[PDB]
Amino acid sequence: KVFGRCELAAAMKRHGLDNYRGYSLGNWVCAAKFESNFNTQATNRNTDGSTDYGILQINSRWWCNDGRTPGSRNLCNIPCSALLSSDITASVNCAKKIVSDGNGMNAWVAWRNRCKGTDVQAWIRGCRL
């Protein structure tokens, strides 16, 4: 599923991500924009053999099991495929773990490089929330 901007904002709020660990909804929407272009089915292989899955490009090196990432962990206790669903529940639950891991949203390199410090409120502007 390819979310619209306000549509994703609403689903993230519904699942308790707005202001989670102090990150406003615009931060989460901006990260989703540049990680997946709002596409729940996005997958991308990393040079180290791991793969990033879903709307927030969660990495199989640490967070989900895809059965082909040697030495990886599965700290969200989830098949990586569950992160590709049209319902964003699993991606949100796992992202909550990731953003609580110590480095905040810097875990998402695209967030650090493209959202951090910017006018992230633009991403929810005009949204009925």
Ligand SMILES: [Cl-]
């Ligand atoms: Cl915001």
Ligand SMILES: [Cl-]
């Ligand atoms: Cl933080």
Ligand code: NA
């Ligand atoms: Na893994």
